[PDB]
Symmetry: C2
Subunit: 457 residues, 2 copies
């Protein structure tokens, strides 16, 4: 078979996008609880009722039924985040919140009960609001300690229940979304490249430090980074556009180069110099970065981009989704190869999927469902490209479909753009029964997993 | 100052393309002595008078004068090959030929007397003809032994005269030029991909072996590979074209990957299976390759190439590039692109060991009465490419130096002709062998002198 026998098939969410129960069992407020309009929207002074993340999909209470569905599809892996504000409500507590730790104990146990391995993102846009408001988030080096305290607590607690960990979901998303991403509550107009890059530096050092701690705790742990995969193509063979495209890709490669190689790459100096960025290193930083680099690289992949040296563009060769995003399955094979060529370490595709406004409708069998042939087609083409990449010799640990049960979106905090194999009946206004339904893609994907990919051909 | 203080500035030739003196001082025949039409041409059973390489430019005798010219330009480096057949005429002798070793001792000595570091290519398309005939060259594993015998011999002899060594000029040349590059005697139509890749495997193993030996002899030696650099661009943003371009570049990356990384790369498995290639490893091969990898990567660069998943809708002309009189497209930015691609992949120092512009230079008298060449085309080419090298240095790429190809006009490899000239120094000899063989400073001589002496500062 093309797919390895140990290949991990699954789905992925973030805690804040599903759990709800934002006020329960001593959970402190996160940044997401003041973001009713999502990452692109403004923050409220206090949580408001129209914020869908308060309730989410109520995964916090519904996880056993949900996990039953995951199990019927045959997942051997499930990616989620541990919500930081559940373990350390303010973030500065001397002791963890035991009800939080107990909750995740139960979650993981339930997963293992069905033969499903947890894959845990330590920080996924969940920063305790107190830390954000008090320290302005990651612009403050004190965040490292807080994060360390968080990580250790959970690494130790779950050390026999969780093999796979991710430190940060895209450290560099701090650049576009300082608040959601870095818990930085200073207005974007007031943030220099210097402050943003310094904040990302603190994240990278924390990632390394936590990698060290992890390895001391359990030598069986696998610790990955998580970055945005976006292969870039030149609009034309004009060498000026080829070079523009290279330079564009370096923006992203900088952070993965730190994660994997353990030092700021050769081209950083120039860029920093041209952008007035000078990273302030604490004396321990270089050695932490160099000595503790990631075991694997995980990434989100949605689309490619086309670049030009002209004072990117719309690729005329790509189809677009009903929602208006272009679609590029070959770009997945391309970026898998680019990353592998560059780093020679295992890769994990941890976010991929097709968003659409699915409509729940009774099929001719009387079952309420979503006829999403579009999602089946997207997943199929992408996974065939994954198969090509496996044959190219790229090491790929697995694939977790993004928002495998419909979740609240990160960017807008809406439910109507749906990624899931499982439809959840709850709407943008908060209404609905919260019942779950299998989409047609549920059955197809079940088939792919149970055949370990052979059904793709 | 943007160029490092220690930057190496110079010129490059191969022995067979300049030296002449093909039968002198105990020299044995090389494969080049039976290639009067060059690597693209047929081999002759015995050397023929129409072969320009018999006399070359007679660098063998005139090297002191030529080197005084190199020194007037301010070269701190000069790249050539040691002709294998001057050391081991047949290749299988128990003892080396002392007249040849003495010759290179004297050559390197003049170089150092003028403050020029030698850069020595161990094998540059010069395999002793005896070995090519007897063993059919690199298809036979015994070549490893002979090559090793040869390299140790020179590595030891020159251990205090030569710091920088290259093992092979393009191992993968074998694919296109089995006889010229691999000493492989067998008719081109009778050679499978399997045989060629096996020959190349032998070369790679031999390169690692010699790397081990070099390190035992002198820990200050720096050993490097030499590959063809050819950055590829997709004709359109169609991801099919982008993938076709990626695939194309892997053909080349395979060999540099073994040299630098020390193992056959991940995509090789698929490519080999599709092409009926199965490499036969000796028991110690994999560990040798893994443990002894090059200190640096050196390359030739002339041009980029554009690729399409479907070429017949139009190995394609790049609309945006200028072309030389001779008819090659010109792509300076491509040099920055490829320096960065290599450094991104391997993170080791790079060395540009072949670059230049070929043209039919006309020797004509200027207004000062001096016979010269008005080669401003060549000045423009070098200026633009060296400005791209400067960009790459600012990009943080580690670059050891630059050696202009055929710095003194030399016999070409592909055609064995003199009329297409790369040099800063014109040599009067023509395709039919005629002429005085006198040397003349081209206009580019003075300009390049100023570049070197300012350490690149004159480029700005």
């Amino acid at each position: 078979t093309i797919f390895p026998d140990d290949f991990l098939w699954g789905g992925a969410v973030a805690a804040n996008q599903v759990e709800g129960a934002y006020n329960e069992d001593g959970k402190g407020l996160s940044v997401q609880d003041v973001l009713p309009k999502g990452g692109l929207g403004e923050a409220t002074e206090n949580p408001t009722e129209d914020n869908l993340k308060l309730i989410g999909i109520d995964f916090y209470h519904k996880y056993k039924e949900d996990i039953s569905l995951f199990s019927e599809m045959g997942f051997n892996v499930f990616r989620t985040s541990i919500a930081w504000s559940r373990i350390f409500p303010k973030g500065d507590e001397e002791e963890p919140n035991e009800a939080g730790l107990k909750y995740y104990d139960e979650l993981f146990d339930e997963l293992h009960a069905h033969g499903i391995e947890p894959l845990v993102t330590l920080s996924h846009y969940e920063t305790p609001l107190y830390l954000a408001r008090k320290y302005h988030g990651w612009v403050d080096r004190r965040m490292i300690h807080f994060y360390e305290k968080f990580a250790r607590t959970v690494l130790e607690r779950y050390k026999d229940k969780v093999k796979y960990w991710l430190t940060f979901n895209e450290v560099n998303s701090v650049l576009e979304l300082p608040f959601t991403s870095g818990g930085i509550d200073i207005p974007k107009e007031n943030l220099s490249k210097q402050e943003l890059y310094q904040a990302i530096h603190h994240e990278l050092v924390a990632s390394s430090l936590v990698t060290k701690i992890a390895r001391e705790i359990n030598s069986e742990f696998k610790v990955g980074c998580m970055v945005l995969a976006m292969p870039a193509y030149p609009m034309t063979p004009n060498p000026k556009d080829v070079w523009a495209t290279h330079e564009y890709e370096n923006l992203n490669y900088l952070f993965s180069d730190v994660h994997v190689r353990g030092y700021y790459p050769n081209y950083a100096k120039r860029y920093f110099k041209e952008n007035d960025i000078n990273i302030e290193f604490a004396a321990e930083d270089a050695e932490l970065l160099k000595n503790y680099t990631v075991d694997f690289l995980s990434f989100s992949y949605y689309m490619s981009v086309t670049q030009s040296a002209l004072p990117g563009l719309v690729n005329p060769y790509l189809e677009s989704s009903e929602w208006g995003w272009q679609i590029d399955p070959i770009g997945l094979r391309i970026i898998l190869n680019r990353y592998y060529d560059r780093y020679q370490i295992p890769l994990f595709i941890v976010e991929n999927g097709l968003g659409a406004k699915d409509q729940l409708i009774k099929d001719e069998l009387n079952n309420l469902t979503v006829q999403d042939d579009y999602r089946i087609q997207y997943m199929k083409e992408h996974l065939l490209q994954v198969a090509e990449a496996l044959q190219d010799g790229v090491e790929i640990m697995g694939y977790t479909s993004w928002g495998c049960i419909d979740c609240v979106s990160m960017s807008t905090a809406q439910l109507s753009k749906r990624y899931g194999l499982i439809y959840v009946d709850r709407n943008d206004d908060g209404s609905g029964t919260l019942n779950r339904y299998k989409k047609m893609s549920f059955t197809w994907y079940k088939e792919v997993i149970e055949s370990n990919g052979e059904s793709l051909f």
